[model samples]
Target: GSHMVGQLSRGAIAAIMQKGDTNIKPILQVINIRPITTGNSPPRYRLLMSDGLNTLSSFMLATQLNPLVEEEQLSSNCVCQIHRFIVNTLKDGRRVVILMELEVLKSAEAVGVKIGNPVPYNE
Candidate 1:
């Protein structure tokens, strides 16, 4: 059942529970990889949230919702998942500004990018 399709946005998936039509705001923590410049590529986000975060699973559970993820961007350690849901929410001549979180750590330490100057803590 695609019940909670309303709350799924480009933000953190945890920190709030959608317990059957109750108004629970998604508690998202955003990580901006860089400054808000003139041309930023959607400022690639990480959408940090609960260590117990498991929204991806919920998406799979939805009978009517098929999971959509960038397979090139997903892995066992870290995954990026979206929905088969494109919100039917259209307002009166206004762009819906969605707030999303990007993992600065991931970008800084992106695959094939040197993390640089590693100093072992337990040396």
Candidate 2:
């Protein structure tokens, strides 16, 4: 539904990114996406997602979901319901959200602009 774009789960980013809660599935807006290549490894996609209130740039799409990005179905301003994901801690102790399964409820064309006044989530 196009109205889903205006229904972002507020504070979900703080619960997941700041408090490390994994029990909730957040519906967030895809602010941006970028392809990343690490030497011989398969290409990866980095995402910047927003939860209506704040934005987090620590999201990584699972390799299997690459097709969505390649097909331009999961581009900027798309509202996604994150169904399955895991929180990973890097060697440097930084936590990242690995999105395993998700659904794009609203396309960027439908949601045109960013949902709310969200600022970067600082650690």
Q: Relative to the unseen true structure, what is the C-alpha lDDT of residue 116 in candidate 2, on a scale of 0 to 100?
A: 71
lDDT per residue, candidate 2, 1-123, as tens digits? 455435999999999977887779889999999987686887999999999989999999999999999976999998899999999988998988999999998888988889878999996
Candidate 1 has its poorest 10 consecutive residues by lDDT at 114-123
lDDT of 1 by residue, 8-120 (tens): 23223322222222133332211211223334333232222222223222111121211212322222233222222221224563211232222222222233221122221
As a TM-score, model 1 comes out at 0.20
lDDT for model 2 = 0.90
- Per-model clash counts, in order, read 5, 0
> What would you estimate as the lDDT of candidate 1?
0.24
Q: Roughly what TM-score does model 2 have, to 2 decimal places?
A: 0.92
Q: State how far residue 48 of model 2 sits from its true place (Å).
A: 0.6
CA lDDT of every candidate: 0.24, 0.90
Steric clash pairs (candidate 2)? none
